[PDB]
Amino acid sequence: VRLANRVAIITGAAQGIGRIYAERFAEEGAAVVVADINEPKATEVASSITSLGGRAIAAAVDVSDVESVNRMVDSAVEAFGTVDILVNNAAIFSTLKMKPFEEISGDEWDKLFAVNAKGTFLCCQAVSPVMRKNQYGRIINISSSVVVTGRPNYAHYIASKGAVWALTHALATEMGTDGITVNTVSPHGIITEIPRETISEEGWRRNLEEQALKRKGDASDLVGILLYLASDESKFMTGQTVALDAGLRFT
Amino acid sequence: VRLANRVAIITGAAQGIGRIYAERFAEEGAAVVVADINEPKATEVASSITSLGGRAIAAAVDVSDVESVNRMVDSAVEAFGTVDILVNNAAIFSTLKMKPFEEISGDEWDKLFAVNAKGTFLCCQAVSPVMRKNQYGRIINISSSVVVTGRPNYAHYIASKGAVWALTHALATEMGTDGITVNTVSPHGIITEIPRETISEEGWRRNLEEQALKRKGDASDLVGILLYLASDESKFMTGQTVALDAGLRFT
Amino acid sequence: VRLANRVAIITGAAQGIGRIYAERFAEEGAAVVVADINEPKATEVASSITSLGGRAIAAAVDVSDVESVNRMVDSAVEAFGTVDILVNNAAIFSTLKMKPFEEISGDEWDKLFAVNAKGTFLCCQAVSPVMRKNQYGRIINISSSVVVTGRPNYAHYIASKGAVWALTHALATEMGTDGITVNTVSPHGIITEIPRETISEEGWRRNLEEQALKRKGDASDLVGILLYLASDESKFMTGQTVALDAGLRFT
Amino acid sequence: VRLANRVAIITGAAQGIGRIYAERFAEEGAAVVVADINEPKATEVASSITSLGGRAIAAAVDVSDVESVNRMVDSAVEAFGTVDILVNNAAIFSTLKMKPFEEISGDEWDKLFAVNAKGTFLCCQAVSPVMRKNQYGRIINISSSVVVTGRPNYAHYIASKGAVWALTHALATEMGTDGITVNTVSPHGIIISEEGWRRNLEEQALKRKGDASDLVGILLYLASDESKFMTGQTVALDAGLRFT
Ligand SMILES: NC(=O)c1ccc[n+]([C@@H]2O[C@H](COP(=O)([O-])OP(=O)(O)OC[C@H]3O[C@@H](n4cnc5c(N)ncnc54)[C@H](O)[C@@H]3O)[C@@H](O)[C@H]2O)c1
Ligand SMILES: NC(=O)c1ccc[n+]([C@@H]2O[C@H](COP(=O)([O-])OP(=O)(O)OC[C@H]3O[C@@H](n4cnc5c(N)ncnc54)[C@H](O)[C@@H]3O)[C@@H](O)[C@H]2O)c1
Structure with a gap:
């Protein structure tokens, strides 16, 4: 019951790691808004959660569209009364083609x-009024290990996650006046059901040599820190990655 | 039951934050070794834990004395069969007199x-054989916010916690071969039942101005991350602060 | 003559700190491309440098426009034969009005x-061919102390400099195979750009309270590290901030 | 002439990179105190520097001995009137044998x-009064890439450089009131067989072999007035x- 009586929006939750966040958050008592650009697949996740005794709705959202984001939050409040937790998991990543940065168009x-x-x-803007009204909130933004390691052939992805990493700092300051915390999780090497071109064979060989724990990751390696950051007990932690x-890497 | 069927040594656990770690770990099902330089007072914490339904022994230890440390770990294994978790909380801190660094003697x-x-x-050396034997371990070292902020008048304390911070990186590499994780927790601003002159009134005004969350801390602000780091679910996290x-500060 | 027989492009160089970079690089022997959206003002700067004995041309550039950026690099190579150094100083900051992040539009x-x-x-893309061909390059990107401190009311600016900060890591990897280094300088926000009016004494005392070094800062304080990062003295440094x-702050 | 009319103490300066710091600092106009446990070898460095037109003296120092450290600073002020720059380069590292951390005794x-x-x-204590009196100081402490990478088999060395790294922060605060800066340089631990070079190059973004010239530039920056606004940095x- 780690998240009993709390409401969480998770973007990008129709598949991959975000789906696991939604399922595990609901197992821990959270009412979950499964938010995704893919409404049928988000509905499959929410229906799976409800059929196991949890509370969940699906919400179609294009996180790049401000009114779609506002409607997503409206749907959360209409269903569950409030928003306690936002996990900004939606990202373009799995579909990327690896290419040298000279080959990345300005459009891409x-x-x-x-x-x-x-x-x-x-999304952070859209939950701000409800979290400030209730003087409570947990925002979890998602960066990536490649921000610190600068792995090749994804330079725009790396820069975008650098923007998220810095944004967390600004938002922790501005939203902390109402007790709201804002933190960043930086995953590395997490294998899910979604195939990706992110890490090659020579890339995993290098990662395992550089890691202290000589193994690949899976979703279960992330759920614990997300539960901590989304829970009441992380109340003193904000602005951290x-x-x-x-x-x-070590910190 | 976050720590069910696990055995934790906590040094410096006869008072302050370490006592709270011991009490909370035991509430979560850990068998706790309350290790401290005050054996009767550590016995007082352990007796209180057992009177509430927890599993706990006390162990006298001078962590600067290798033989004393070795007997502490032997006592843990004798009582509980293994050691799963080591929290290196013992430190000279609350007793410190603040002084400019030129006035710190070499003996100090x-x-x-x-x-x-x-x-x-x-302590990390002493738990290494049992953790490697069992191919499992959680080591939590304790640094301090003053390592990063460089607050004045505690230069030897700051340097000693910088040594702990770097040591965690070496140990994460060397012990990770057997799955053992080693991480550092850096507290700030935690008020306990023990008075200390570490932060002045003008110092708290500065801290509150710089903090995103405008309040002082207490032990409940730390227990959650210690439970995460000591638990099975932090298995993928090592070498972090x-x-x-x-x-x-932000990270 | 620390930059003798080197060619340097500096963007946003018609005024403020970028102009000082241009003037000081030229004094140290660099042929300088004064690149700026304001071609008449950039030409003035170039004329000032040349009449003082330096080598400089002006180039109009809209750094957000790939064709304008490509034309700037062509102008540099056509005038001076190569590009050795790129300083990505162009940025929106001075014109910004403080506003809480909820009031920043998506368009803004x-x-x-x-x-x-x-x-x-x-700009990094456009210099990549000439630097790779010559097996030589120094790229200096610019962040700001506001990224690490999370200063309020500049959330989009902070996020944009996080993007630059992470981008440096990707580019250090991708360009370091050809002997090109890529680093980031993070100036104190108070010296980020030349102020229009002199910082009041009360404002200086508020800033000094947060500094370890109790001294007032100015533009000469950034020139030294830029000269280091643009010169052969930094040939082994890449991917650093x-x-x-x-x-x-401390690091 | 980037260090003209400045006085620099460099510990561990009789050989290795410390000797190169001393030589290059003297070339840039600094009066150099070549400080080392090996006074004969340090005297040979100072005489080598002097015969090339620079200013240098040798000082024996055991940096672990407060009386020896104080005698070193007194010798510097006796020769040159002040101390502007301190480079705390002395360290036990090259003699170290690799061993797992369980095998490091408390005495080691x-x-x-x-x-x-x-x-x-x-050493920082001993230069503090002269630097505070003159309202000027550049202190350069030395860490190592092994701190951030956590290389195996050097755990006490790594911890000792973490202590230095944190100490720089404390001293930047306490000495910055008097216009003194304190910063840390973290050299790549590698500064070897070709196979060893290639293993090291695999981990580097910049595919180039490093040597001592690669550290002199940042030391000159940090010891000079060009870094007068930088303090408490690594x-x-x-x-x-690694990237930062
Ligand atoms: N709403 C939109 O506009 C939009 C756009 C694109 C994608 N999406 C959604 O987002 C989801 C994408 O899922 P996916 O499989 O591509 O990604 P994912 O399941 O791996 O999501 C992982 C999240 O963590 C980050 N991350 C970085 N390194 C990681 C690592 N090693 N392990 C784990 N996470 C890491 C990713 O960038 C991302 O933010 C989909 O459900 C898709 O519909 C939404
Ligand atoms: N040789 C030994 O075995 C030995 C020596 C000295 C102390 N100890 C024991 O350790 C305990 C010390 O308790 P205490 O009251 O001095 O410390 P504390 O309970 O306030 O803090 C415990 C740990 O947190 C660290 N810390 C960092 N930031 C902090 C913050 N904001 N607030 C508090 N702690 C912070 C301390 O350095 C220490 O490692 C006592 O039980 C004492 O007997 C043991």
């Missing part, structure tokens, strides 16, 4: 920033 | 390093 | 990112 | 800390082994 740069950076910003990376 | 410097840095090192500081 | 966010983040990215902040 | 830990951490502390010279 902008389109990825619109979801990854602007979209996180817009927490890396879940098997010691790929 | 050495005595503080013997407890804070060497003492943490010796987690600051609990109300946003005094 | 996008317009600032187009210059601050995308603009730096486009260097903060010039009188110890406002 | 203490002996290494006495030089690497306490020694830096004592500057890594590591070819992008």
Whole structure:
């Protein structure tokens, strides 16, 4: 019952790690808004959660569109009365083609920033009035290990997550006046059901040599820190970045 | 039951935050070794834990004394069969007199390093054989926000906690081969039942101005991250420093 | 003559700190491309440098426009034969009005990112061919102390400089195979740009309270590290962020 | 002439990178105190510097010994009238044999800390009065890439450099009231067989071999007036082994 009587919006929750956040948050008592651009798949996640005794709705959202984001929050409040937790998990990543940064058009740069950076910003704006009204909130933004490691062939993705990482600092200051916390989780090496071109064979060989724990990650490696950050007991932690990376890097 | 069927050694646990770690860990099902330089007072904490339904023993330890440390770990294994968790909380801190660094004698410097840095090192050496044997361990070292903020008049304390901070990185690498994780918690501004001259009134005005969350801290602000780090679910996190500081600094 | 027989492009160089970079790089022997949206004002700066014995041309550039950026690099190579150094100083900051992040429109966010983040990215792309061909390059990107401190009322600016900060890491990896270094300078926000009016004494005392070094800062304080990062003295440094902040924060 | 009319103490300066710091500082106009446990070898460095037209003296110092450290600063002020710059380069490292941390005795830990951490502390104490009186100081402490990377088999060395790293922050605060700056340089630990170079290059962003010239530039920056607004920072010279 780690999240009993709390309401969480998770963007990008129709698949991958965000789906696991939604399922586990609902197992821990949260009423979950499964928010995704893919409404049928988000409905499949929410229906799976409800059929197991949890509370969940699906909400279609384009996080790059301000009125879609506002409608998503409206749907959360209409269903569950409030929003306690926002996890800004939606991102363009799995669909990326690896390419040298010279080959990234300005259009591809902008389109990825619109979801990854602007979209996180817009969602934070949309939950701000409800969290300030209740003088309570947990915002969890999502960066990536590649921000610190600067891995090749994803330079726009890396820059967009750098924007999210810095945004957390600004929002922790501005929203902390109402007790709201804002933190960043930086995952590394998490394998899900969604295939991706992110890490190659030579890329995993390098990662395992650099990691302190010599293994790949999975979703269960992230759920714990998300539960901590979303829960009442993280009340004193804000403006921090927490890396879940098997010691790929040290802090 | 966050720590069910786990055994935790907490040094410096006869008072202050370490006593709260012991009490809360035991409430979550851990068998706790209340280790401290005051054996009767550590016995008082352990007796209180057992009178509430918890599993706990007390152990006298001078963490600067390798033989004393070795007997502490032997006592833990004798009582509870293993050690799963080590919290290196013992430090010279609340007793410190503040002074400009030119006024710190070499003997003052050495005595503080013997407890804070060497003492943490010796405890990690002593639990290494049992954690490697069982291919499992959670080591939590304790630094301090003053390592990053460089507050005045405690230069030897700051340097000793910088040694702990770096030591965590070396140990994460060397012990991760057997799955053991090693992380650092960096508290700030936690008020306990023990008075201390570490922060003045003008110092708190400065801290509250710099913090994102405008309040002082207490022990409940720290227990949650210690439970996460000591628990099975932090398995993918190693070599990290987690600051609990109300946003005094950002990461 | 620390930059003798080197060619340097500086964006946003018609006024403020960028002009000082241009003037000081030229004094140290660099051929300087004074790149700015204001071609007449940039030509004035170039004329001032040349009449004092330096080598400089002006180039009009809209760093958010890929074709304008490409034309700037062509002008540099056509005039001086190569590009050795790129300083991505162009940024929207002085014109910004303080506003809480909820009041920043998506369009305002996008317009600032187009210059601050995308603009730096486009310029790095445009110099990449000439630097790779010559197996030599020094790229200096610019962040700000507000990223680490999370100053309020500039959330989009902060996020855009987080994007630049992370982008430096990606570019250091991708360009370091050809002997090109990429680093970030983070000036104290108070010296981020030349103020229009002199900082009042009361304002200086508020700033000094946060500094470890109790001294007032100015533009000469950034020139030294830029000269280091643009010169062969930094040939082994890449992917780093260097903060010039009188110890406002520590690293 | 970037260090013209300045006086620099460099500990551990009779050999290795410390000797190169001293030589290059003297070339840039500094009056150099070549300080080392090996006074004969340090005298050879000072005489080498002097015969090339620079100003230098040798001072024997055991940086773990407060009386020896005080005699070193007195010798510097006796020769040159002041101390502007202190580079705390003395460290136990090259002699170290790799061993898992379980095998490091408490005595080995203490002996290494006495030089690497306490020694830096004592030298900073000893230059404090002259630097505060003159309202001027550049202190450069030395860490290592192994602190951030957590390389195996050097745990006490790593911890001792973490102590130095944090100490710089405390001293930047306490000495910055008098216009003194305190910063840390973190060199790549590698500064070797070709196979070893290639293993090291694999981890670097910049695919170039490093040497001592790669550290002199940042030391000159941090010892000079060009860094007068920088304090409490750690500057890594590591070819992008890590990013910051
Ligand atoms: N609303 C929109 O406009 C929009 C746009 C694109 C994608 N999305 C949604 O987002 C989801 C994308 O899922 P996915 O499989 O692509 O990504 P995912 O399941 O791996 O999501 C992971 C999140 O963590 C970050 N991350 C970085 N490194 C990681 C690591 N090693 N492990 C885990 N997370 C890491 C990712 O950038 C992302 O923010 C989908 O449901 C999709 O519909 C939404
Ligand atoms: N040789 C030994 O075994 C030994 C030596 C000295 C002390 N100790 C024991 O350790 C305990 C010390 O308790 P205490 O009251 O001095 O410390 P505390 O309970 O206030 O703090 C415990 C730990 O948190 C760290 N810390 C960092 N930031 C802090 C903050 N904001 N507030 C509080 N602590 C912060 C301390 O350095 C220490 O490692 C006592 O039980 C004492 O007997 C043991």
